[PDB]
Design a protein around this ligand. Sequence first.
Ligand SMILES: [Mg+2]
Ligand SMILES: [Mg+2]
Lengths: 58, 95, 189, 72
Amino acid sequence: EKSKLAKVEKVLGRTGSRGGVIQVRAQFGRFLIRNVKGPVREGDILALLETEREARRL
Amino acid sequence: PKKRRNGGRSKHNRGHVNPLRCSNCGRCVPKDKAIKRFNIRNIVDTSAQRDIKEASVYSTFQLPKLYIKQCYCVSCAIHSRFVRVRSREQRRVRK
Amino acid sequence: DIKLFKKWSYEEINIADLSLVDCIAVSQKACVYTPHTAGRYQKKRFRKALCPIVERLVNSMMMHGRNNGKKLKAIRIVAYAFEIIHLMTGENPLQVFVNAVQKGGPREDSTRIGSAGVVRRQAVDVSPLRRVNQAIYLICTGARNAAFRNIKSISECLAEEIINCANESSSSYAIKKKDEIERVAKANR
Amino acid sequence: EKLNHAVFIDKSLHSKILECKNMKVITPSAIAEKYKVNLSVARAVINHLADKKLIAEVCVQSHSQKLYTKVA
RNA sequence: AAUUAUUAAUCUUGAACGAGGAAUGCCUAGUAAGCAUGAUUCAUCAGAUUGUGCUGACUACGUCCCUGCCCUUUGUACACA
Ligand SMILES: [Mg+2]
Ligand SMILES: [Mg+2]
């Protein structure tokens, strides 16, 4: 219900059956690997609701 | 016809070889013809593995592994892509 | 010294979110007297983020076939709506519309991923540009469907939708749709 | 679910419709909703109240939107 | 040459239809959609076609899941395939 903000550092690739998901690496200052819906750029900011979780590599 | 020199298995200087049973479909296959795979796996993945470390006594814990030694028949093996169909010249490439 | 509609300033308005700041534009080139600019905003990937925020709103009121291309009518509908928002709950009408944009979009969703051949409805995160697009779209449809076959005019419904959205009350079409998306996403991951 | 708006002003309803003058926002849709009168009536009472300067214009009117407010 | 009413003009009458099930089409910019108009056929008849302009959005900046076509390897008792 409360947000946490992270900074995107680079896009890695696109996942999903129809290619509608984006694989990124983000820093809050630990590093995490997250999976994003919608157009993104390096330097964007994401509001993460669940903190301790990741996505598998591609 | 006669598409393989060894006939699809490795038997020489013998009459009969006892069979085993497929790990996936239960079929009977002679031992010298099944494909053998020996897998060393982990109990849990790397994320749930470090949750067990910090909930543990002994302050230095090593999770045990698993040893399986699965065996398969030709049909139940190439449908799961442990083994693929190759070209005529590549069929001879071992190890 | 430039006002919107010659009445409202946007020289003291802030975002106060720090995530949508770079995505919605009230700044040097976006300061216009009237929301009619014949710009070319869909030629690159992100030039949509430089269009003035109020012009994006008027671009969405011309929907359902019967009203395609009627840009001047949409400018009038929004202009009178901003007047009502000022008359009751006396504040800067554009500041209220900024608050609605920041609260009307979901922060996460769910999508089908076949990672291991098995497909789940595993959840994902939403990008700031996607959040802004959703907020504008959800507000307009709520006002549009509220006024069909009703006494209240299109401009009165729009003003009531914007105030309720920025107040987090669950009487707006936007907030209850946002919560329905996030409830499913929470359930799935 | 039918509306049954009245199409004129009764003797009893005559005094009640004039309090509307003391309203934050004044528009035919709001007048008709509070007093259960037509919209053609709601325009008639605004024109009467506006000419005698009991109601203040909020901005320049249009032929499709006619909001007003109390004088103060 | 107007009856089976060519087409236009005036006064009356005032039906279904409250956004449409299973299915399915075309579209990424002055484009979709909305709006009209020139020309063809033409003694007289456009709800059609072929052009032209006016007002002018939302959404993506991808993918091989569905449908097609192409390439490589593999199997065939098919070659009217
Ligand atoms: Mg024998
Ligand atoms: Mg295919």
